[PDB]
């Protein structure tokens, strides 16, 4: 992996140079970016933490489904609506 770090002009280091752990020091603060663990296609319960539907009390095939996705007047679904997908 190659990553691009934004530096000021006084921080330029010659290309080809080795970087080690001691570039940081104890008692410091950093930010760490990485690809999170992929979960594949996931439903709203895992992807967005919806409450779902109750198990018993007559429910037909719905325990883990999104409820209404939009309102009646909107003849469409808003962009950015929380729907199942890759997580």
Partner 1 sequence: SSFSRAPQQWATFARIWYLLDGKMQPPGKLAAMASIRLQGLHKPVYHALSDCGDHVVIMNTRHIAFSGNKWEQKVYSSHTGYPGGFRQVTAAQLHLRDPVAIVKLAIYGMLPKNLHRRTMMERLHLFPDEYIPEDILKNLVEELPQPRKIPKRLDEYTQEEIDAFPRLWTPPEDYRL
**84 binds, options partner 1, Mg ion, none, Cβ within 5 to 8 A by partner type:** none
Q: Say whether 84 sits in a helix, a strand or coil.
A: coil
CB-based burial label for 31 (10 Å; 0-12, 13-18, 19+): exposed
Q: Within 57-86, which residues bind partner 1 (CB under 8 A)? A: 78-80
Reported in sequence order, the residue ranges of 31-84 that DSSP labels E, i.e. its strands, are 41-42
Q: Which is nearer to Mg ion, 54 or 70 (CB)?
A: 54
Q: Which is nearer to partner 1, 41 or 78 (CB)?
A: 78
**58 binds, options Mg ion, partner 1, none, Cβ within 5 to 8 A by partner type:** none
């Amino acid at each position: 992996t190659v990553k691009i770090f934004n530096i000021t002009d006084n921080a330029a280091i010659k290309p080809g140079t080795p970087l080690y752990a001691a570039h940081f020091r104890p008692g410091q603060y950093v930010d760490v970016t990485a690809k999170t663990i992929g979960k594949g296609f996931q439903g709203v319960m895992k992807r967005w933490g919806f409450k779902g539907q109750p198990a018993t009390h007559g429910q037909t095939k719905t325990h883990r489904r999104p409820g209404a996705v939009a309102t009646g007047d909107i003849g469409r679904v808003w962009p950015g609506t929380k729907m199942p997908g890759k997580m």
